[PDB]
Amino acid sequence: LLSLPLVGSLPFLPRHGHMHNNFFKLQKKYGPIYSVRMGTKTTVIVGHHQLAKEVLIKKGKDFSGRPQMATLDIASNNRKGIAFADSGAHWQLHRRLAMATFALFKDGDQKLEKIICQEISTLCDMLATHNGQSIDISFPVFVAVTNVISLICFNTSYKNGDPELNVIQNYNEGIIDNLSKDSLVDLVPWLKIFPNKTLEKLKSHVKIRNDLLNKILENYKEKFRSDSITNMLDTLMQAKMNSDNDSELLSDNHILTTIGDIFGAGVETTTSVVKWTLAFLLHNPQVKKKLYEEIDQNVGFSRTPTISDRNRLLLLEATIREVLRLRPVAPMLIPHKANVDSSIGEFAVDKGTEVIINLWALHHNEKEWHQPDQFMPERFLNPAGTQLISPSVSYLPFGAGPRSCIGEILARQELFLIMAWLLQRFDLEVPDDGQLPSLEGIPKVVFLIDSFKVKIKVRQAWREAQ
Ligand code: HEM
Ligand SMILES: CNC(=O)c1ccc2cc([C@]3(O)CCn4cncc43)ccc2c1
Known part of the structure; x- marks a missing residue:
């Protein structure tokens, strides 16, 4: 009695549990590095820090490519921008100009700390009007970090009530929802097996965003001046200007997509981590209590928190590190690709192989x-x-390495200042219905948390002062 002919085999059920955990569970059986074949494409999953650092750092340039995905093609306007562009001239140029822009907010009066605190001050006055109510703080935080990035990209921001903020929130939501069903890592290409409207829907959301950034970039062409380089769009137009004396790599489409990646990454990533950190503090009142004590003893109520306080609010800094460990923004980074034949742990890896670092x-x-x-x-x-x-x-x-995060300084300062200001001024507690946030998470292009509510109250200590 023979065994059945076997045309296909997968080690775990698709769409059953979180992908990054399914891969992790497999390491018990198969080790820290293994592969899966899907038609012509092979994917390598790496789940140990030594192999990860080889892919990211030691042989970083070998695995600095990105795989091309129909979904990502639409969001990146055919692999323009930074995050989803393959390695090469385009990606290296725009990655440098983006990093170069964050130098112009090192010091001075638009010191990054000051743009951030300005928007946190509006956030905190906003939230204080909800004293005694349970609310979803998603949109208020979204607005604040949207204004920080709009100032870094355009030296402009939105006033309270501007409807354009809601338009952005809408298509941010629609693109993330349709960019991938769960993680970017999908074992089976369902998108190509059964009829569906995923690409249609993603296209219409991308159309609205591209149209919106075009209007901004178009009306700004007449405001640009060579002697005024104070934001990201200036940096990119200066490069386009000093190029027409590599200008194909600085067309309007190239500038738009790159600013889209910064606009998108700068908002959705920071909002999510704030929401996660809040959720954990709700499940851990003991940690929350010690944080209040830490900030009352090291900053008090004479002033508002500053970046310098990062040397004194250690438990707050340790909390942010722990959230970024327990619920990483990208449990599997963004997928990598081997640019040349190389190796990981001395195993052969052919050029074009997709390589995935299981950060989880x-x-x-x-x-x-x-x-x-x-x-x-x-x-x-x-x-x-x-x-x-x-x-x-x-x-x-x-x-780490060539494709590492370029907005790391921004994220760390936003996260620290947002939490410091909120904890100084607000008691943040379980809403009256008693529901706690679900910490399971929703794996998308970003590791999101289910929406939840917090009862916000102006702290008595903050009130008694002033
Ligand atoms: C808590 C906040 C953040 C975390 C944990 C984080 C983490 C990461 C990770 C894991 C990657 C992928 C690394 C790889 O593919 O090997 C990445 C890439 C990237 N991040 Fe973030 N990031 C954060 C915030 C931000 C912010 C605030 C911005 C921009 C304003 C940003 C922009 C980018 C870009 C453009 C890339 C792609 C880089 C490239 O492909 O060359 N990130 N980040
Ligand atoms: C309407 N457009 C959007 O909503 C949008 C566009 C691009 C995005 C890119 C990123 C990254 O670059 C990719 C993942 N990740 C981790 N840290 C930075 C990044 C994250 C969210 C985005 C949202």
Whole structure:
């Protein structure tokens, strides 16, 4: 009695559990590196920090490519921009100009700290009007970080009530929802097997965004001046101007898509982490209580928190590190691709192979972390609690190497200042219905959290002062 002819085999059920965890569970059986074949395409999944650092750092240039996806093609206007552009001249030029722009907010009066605090001050006055009510703080935080990035990109911002903010929120939501069903990593190409309108829907959302950025870029052409380089669009037009004396790599479509990536990444990524951090503080009142004490003893109510306070609010800094470990923004980074024949752990990897770094596995490795599934900001502090520490080398929240995060300085300062200002001024508690946020998460292009509500109250201590 023979065995059945076998035309296909997958190690776990598709659409059953979170992809990054399914891969991690497989390492028990198959090791920290294995492959899956899907037609002509082979994908390698790497789940150990030493192999990850080889792909990202040591052989970074070998695996600095991106795989081309029909979905990502539409969002990136055919692989323009930064995040979804393949390695090469385009990507390297626009990545440098983006990083170069964040230099113009180092110091001065538009010091990045000052643009951020300006928008947090509006956020906090906004939220204070909801004293005693339970609310979803998604949109208020979205507005604040949208204005930070609009100032970095255009030196402009939106006033309260501007309907355009809602238009952006709408198509941000629609693109993320249709960009991928779950993670960017899909084992089966359902998009090409059964009839569906995913690409149609994604196209219409991308049309609205492209139309909106065009209007901004068009009306700004007449305001641009060579001697005034104060934001990202200036940096890009200066390069286009000093090029027509590589100008094909600076067409209007190239400038638009790159600013779209910064606009998108700068908003959806920071809003999500704030929401996650809040959710964890609701499940961990003990940690929340010690944070209030920490900020009352090191900043008080004489002033508002500053970036310099990052040397004094250590537990707050440790909390942000722990959220970025436990619920990484990108559990599997963005997929990589081998530009040439190379190797990982001395295993052959052919050119064109898609390579995926399971950051979730790195952050939950039980040999590298103590009780990895527990929210313990303590793990990033010495036993005394007097200085931050790096307990593990298997920790890469922002990736590393050629394709690493370029908005890391912005994210860290936004996250620290938002939480510092909120904790100084507000009690943040379970809403009166008693529901706690679900910490399971929703894997999309970003690791999102289910929407939830918080009862916001102006702290008595903050009130008694002033
Ligand atoms: C908590 C916040 C953030 C985290 C944890 C984070 C993390 C990451 C990770 C893991 C990657 C992929 C690394 C790889 O593919 O190897 C990435 C890429 C990227 N991030 Fe973020 N990021 C954050 C915030 C931001 C912000 C605020 C911006 C922009 C304003 C930004 C812009 C980008 C871009 C453009 C890329 C693509 C880089 C490239 O492909 O060359 N990120 N980030
Ligand atoms: C209407 N357009 C959008 O909503 C939009 C566009 C591009 C995005 C890119 C990113 C990244 O670059 C890709 C993942 N990730 C982690 N950190 C930075 C990034 C994240 C969200 C985006 C949203």
